[PDB]
Amino acid sequence: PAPQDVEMKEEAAAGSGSAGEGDGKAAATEHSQRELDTVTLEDIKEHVRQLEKAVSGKEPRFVLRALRMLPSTSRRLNHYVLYKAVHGFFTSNNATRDFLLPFLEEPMDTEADLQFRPRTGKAASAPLLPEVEAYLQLLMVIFLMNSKRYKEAQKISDDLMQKISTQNRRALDLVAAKCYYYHARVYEFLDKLDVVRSFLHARLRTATLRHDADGQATLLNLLLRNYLHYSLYDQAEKLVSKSVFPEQANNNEWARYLYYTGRIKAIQLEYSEARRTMTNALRKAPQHTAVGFKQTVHKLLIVVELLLGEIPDRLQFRQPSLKRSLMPYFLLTQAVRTGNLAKFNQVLDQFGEKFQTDGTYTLIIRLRHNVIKTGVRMISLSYSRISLADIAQKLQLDSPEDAEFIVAKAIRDGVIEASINHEKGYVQSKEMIDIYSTREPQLAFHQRISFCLDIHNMSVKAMRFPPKSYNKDLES
């Protein structure tokens, strides 16, 4: 039948998860636990096993088929992703589950280390019991975020995943830490008025008491994403500053943090820094899990780069092959370059609704300073002494006098750097025609030397950690 074919792969899924739990339980093996847990296992569990072969009715077959309700409720947790009490909360195509025929296979392998017989479910006290429970939830959450489940299922995730846990450990908190972040993205997507932020805050207190590196990193990045949606600026600003955000973090974590920090910085008139992190973020983000947030980074970033006075290329639009969705941003790119306001104001209002979703709209209005700035910027840098009159004819500014105030303000900001001599009336470039007399070639090299040294210190410590973890746990 249909669940028999995918049965081979369920034993495979169980092999990787069971081991992962095992590792965690013996002291601090933390580094090896987080790489396994996130993009690597997940890309396989969902896509290869369930979707590709077909049969998504192997997910609540995986976390139940014994009839475990667990000593602290998690029976519901398993239902809601798939097979609510009917055939499919998305895709069924299963003739055996725990509400169709109990048992057909054991991914549970008759030992508490993912799942185990009903004897655990009704009551246990074992030290294997928290370890299976935290783990139980990671396995479930994997289909939730990929398939983009919604509704009530989304609302009840939070309850089971935290306020059943307020005591964990470092091993357990790490697993839970990953589960909360995936649910949080699924939550964000629906654009429900029911507070995403509130749960994520409650989860933070538990993260902090165990003092688990992982818990702080995951929650914090999501908490910023939540904050942007509501559009309550002050809290996110403080929260970003508090995040130390560890150097030993998963790839998806790295791309998402830089991305949030960029959104926050862009409105602020810290656009030079915002644009670098946002460009980086797109590259760093994967091909599979990342896709919802990923879209949003490329759309926002095009506006953010303009804010610095960068003129973004056509290759940028064509190459990921999203050019259609990007088409309006493309229009802003043209408008910024020309130096004339009329085209920029018109586009801002017309696409206004579409921009607001992505969270661009607050950044779009800031470009009005930038429309003129980007055009005066090319002209001031290129030439030496040029008249305000040249700037105004080319750019289509109102007056040379108008153009004179505008250049003055920019040199104060210092992203065009010049000194104006309104005698004859030219704007003058800064330039020394030798930078060897100045420290600047040395200072440039020296900065690299600090940046380089950081890589050496990071590498020596990181290198031994996974083989060490493997030694205690025993390797074949």
Binding site: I311, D313, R337
Partner: peptide
């Protein structure tokens, strides 16, 4: 984005012949 130079090709060849006389 697209280079303004292309549009410039047709305009630049013609300009050359006139300009030399017009201005020193």
């Amino acid at each position: 984005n697209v280079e303004d130079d292309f549009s410039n090709q047709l305009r630049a060849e013609l300009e050359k012949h006139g300009y030399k006389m017009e201005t020193s």
